[PDB]
């Protein structure tokens, strides 16, 4: 249980897999890796593969099975659905760039508009936080000029989750799509 800085990429995956060796995660302990790690481009710019029209999502390591580690890469003006995370431990650590998110409220089962409850902007090299409990968020790159970069940590892995809308809170099962795996594009 002793968390050390990760000196490199590939030295937080080395320690990432020994958190999550249990059945149970320190959710503290995995962000305060996280966070630790300085990003440094040469070291992820093989998974940074852009598209000119959305976001993607880059498979890094797949933990032993334990979690997804991926790499997601937003173009400027780039946003998501406002999702959930499917009972997983959701991590989001900026490689590059900035993101907003913006939480919400479950919807409540009448059909009425998601009214934000709150909005923060994530930074370069911090590392946020969320699950199901916490609420659903949609993420941004708000840039005209500058594409950000996230890591993300999901414990345990997912394939499908669902993205709401935010007019009416009807939700809709959506599959996750890698634009990559393991450095190799996979369309």
């Given at each position: 249980?002793?968390?050390?800085?990760?000196?490199?990429?590939?030295?937080?995956?080395?320690?990432?897999?020994?958190?999550?060796?249990?059945?149970?995660?320190?959710?503290?302990?995995?962000?305060?890796?996280?966070?630790?790690?300085?990003?440094?481009?040469?070291?992820?710019?093989?998974?940074?593969?852009?598209?000119?029209?959305?976001?993607?999502?880059?498979?890094?390591?797949?933990?032993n099975g334990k979690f997804n580690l991926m790499i997601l890469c937003w173009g400027?003006?780039?946003?998501?659905?406002?999702?959930?995370?499917?009972?997983?431990?959701?991590?989001?650590?900026?490689?590059?760039?900035?993101?907003?998110?913006?939480?919400?409220?479950?919807?409540?089962?009448?059909?009425?508009?998601?009214?934000?409850?709150?909005?923060?902007?994530?930074?370069?090299?911090?590392?946020?936080?969320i699950n199901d409990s916490i609420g659903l968020h949609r993420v941004e790159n708000?840039?005209?000029?500058?594409?950000?970069?996230?890591?993300?940590?999901?414990?345990?892995?997912?394939?499908?989750?669902?993205?709401?809308?935010?007019?009416?809170?009807?939700?809709?099962?959506?599959?996750?799509?890698?634009?990559?795996?393991?450095?190799?594009?996979?369309?």
């Amino acid at each position: 249980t002793e968390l050390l800085k990760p000196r490199t990429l590939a030295d937080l995956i080395r320690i990432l897999h020994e958190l999550f060796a249990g059945d149970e995660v320190n959710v503290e302990e995995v962000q305060a890796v996280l966070e630790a790690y300085e990003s440094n481009p040469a070291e992820w710019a093989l998974y940074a593969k852009f598209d000119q029209y959305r976001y993607t999502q880059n498979l890094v390591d797949q933990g032993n099975g334990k979690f997804n580690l991926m790499i997601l890469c937003w173009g400027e003006g780039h946003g998501s659905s406002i999702h959930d995370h499917t009972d997983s431990h959701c991590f989001l650590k900026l490689l590059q760039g900035n993101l907003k998110e913006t939480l919400f409220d479950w919807p409540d089962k009448k059909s009425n508009e998601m009214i934000k409850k709150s909005e923060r902007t994530l930074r370069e090299n911090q590392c946020a936080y969320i699950n199901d409990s916490i609420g659903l968020h949609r993420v941004e790159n708000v840039s005209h000029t500058e594409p950000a970069v996230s890591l993300h940590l999901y414990s345990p892995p997912f394939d499908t989750r669902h993205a709401f809308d935010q007019r009416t809170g009807h939700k809709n099962k959506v599959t996750m799509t890698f634009h990559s795996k393991f450095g190799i594009r996979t369309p």
